[PDB]
Design a protein around this ligand. Structure first.
Ligand SMILES: O=c1ccn([C@@H]2O[C@H](COP(=O)(O)OP(=O)(O)OP(=O)(O)O)[C@@H](O)[C@H]2O)c(=O)[nH]1
Length: 282
C-alpha cells in the first residue's frame, strides 16, 4: 500500500564523535545549522511520509526536544517579534507530521533497533532512514524510492556505486539489472573482500521494507544483522536495489561530516558566498 512511516535509528553509541556525542547522539550533529536527523526527517516528509518513529538510545531527549514543541523557545522568540525564526522553528515538525519515540534499551545494533519499532509499524511498509548517511538529492532520495516502491510494491534498498577496493566497508547486492537504476536482487552479502564482491553496488542507509522483514529479524541467531534479514526476505519475495540519484555524505565518520559541512555551507544562502571566498584565499 502506501509508505506513511519512517523509522529513524538514532540509538548508536556514536563513539566516533566523542567527546561531542557524550550527551547528544551523532544524528544530532549539525551540518552548518541543522542536525543530521532533521535533514533525514525533511527527506521523509518530501517523500509523503507523515509519521516519524525514532528509536532512541543514550541522550534521547536531544532528539525528542529537537522535534517536540518547546514552550521556552517560542516564548523567547515570541517576546521578540522574530517571526521568520518562529516559522523556521515550527517547520521542524510541520502540522500533520507525528513523532513517536521508542527506546532501544541496549545498543545491540541496527537490526535490533529496527526490530524495536515493529509494533509501531505493524502491518505496513515503512522507511528506514539512517541520518548518519546525509543524502543530497533532487528529488530527495527517499522520495525517489517511494516512487519506486509505489510502482513495484517491493522492498527497496538504496545503493550507490562504490570503489571495488572498498567493498569490505559495505553491504553489497547482486542480481539482475532491470532498469538503468533498478536491480532485482538475488543476494546481499555483508562486507565481502574485493576479489569476491558480487558487484560494486553498496548499500546506504535508506530502505523501504515490507513488514515481513520482522519475522526474519526475530528469527535470526544473535547484534542481529539487517543484511541477513534482507537476504532471508528475498528468498520469499522480490527485493529491489535502487541506484539513487544524488550524493551521500558518510557522516558516521568525521571526514564525511566535514565534506558535508563544506559542501552544504557552499550552497547555504546566508554564508555561501563568503565561505567560498574564504576557501579560495586561505
Ligand atoms: O545499537 C545500535 C547501533 C546502531 N544504531 C543505529 O544504526 C546506524 C548505524 O550506526 P553504527 O552501528 O555504525 O554505530 P555508530 O556510528 O553510532 O557508532 P560509532 O561507530 O560512532 O561507535 C545509526 O542510525 C545508529 O543510530 C542503533 O540505532 N542502535
Amino acid at each position: 500500500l502506501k509508505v506513511n512511516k519512517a523509522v529513524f535509528p538514532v540509538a548508536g553509541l556514536g563513539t566516533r564523535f566523542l567527546p561531542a556525542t557524550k550527551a547528544s547522539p551523532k544524528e544530532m550533529l549539525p551540518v552548518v545549522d541543522k542536525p543530521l536527523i532533521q535533514y533525514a526527517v525533511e527527506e521523509a516528509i518530501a517523500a509523503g511520509i507523515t509519521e516519524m518513529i525514532f528509536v532512541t538510545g543514550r541522550s534521547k531527549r536531544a532528539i525528542e526536544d529537537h522535534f517536540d514543541k518547546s514552550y521556552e523557545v517560542e516564548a523567547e522568540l515570541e517576546a521578540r517579534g522574530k517571526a521568520k525564526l518562529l516559522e523556521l522553528v515550527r517547520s521542524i515538525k510541520p502540522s500533520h507530521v507525528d513523532c513517536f519515540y521508542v527506546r532501544q534499551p541496549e545498543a545491540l545494533g541496527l537490526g535490533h533497533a529496527v526490530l524495536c519499532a515493529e509494533k509501531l509499524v505493524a502491518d505496513n511498509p515503512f522507511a528506514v532512514i539512517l541520518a548518519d548517511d546525509l543524502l543530497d538529492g533532487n528529488p530527495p532520495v527517499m522520495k525517489q524510492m517511494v516512487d519506486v516502491f509505489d510502482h513495484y510494491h517491493s522492498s527497496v534498498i538504496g545503493v550507490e556505486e562504490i570503489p571495488p577496493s572498498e567493498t569490505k566497508s559495505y553491504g553489497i547486492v547482486d542480481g539482475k539489472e532491470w532498469e538503468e537504476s533498478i536491480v532485482k536482487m538475488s543476494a546481499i552479502v555483508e562486507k565481502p573482500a574485493p576479489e569476491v564482491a558480487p558487484s560494486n553496488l553498496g548499500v546506504v542507509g535508506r530502505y523501504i521494507l515490507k513488514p515481513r522483514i520482522f519475522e526474519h529479524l526475530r528469527a535470526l541467531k544473535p547484534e542481529l544483522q539487517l543484511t541477513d534479514a534482507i537476504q532471508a526476505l528475498l528468498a520469499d519475495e522480490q527485493v529491489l536495489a535502487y541506484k539513487y540519484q544524488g550524493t551521500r555524505y558518510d557522516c558516521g565518520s568525521k571526514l564525511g561530516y566535514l565534506k558535508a559541512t563544506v559542501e552544504f555551507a557552499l550552497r547555504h544562502p546566508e554564508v555561501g558566498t563568503e565561505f567560498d571566498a574564504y576557501l579560495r584565499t586561505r
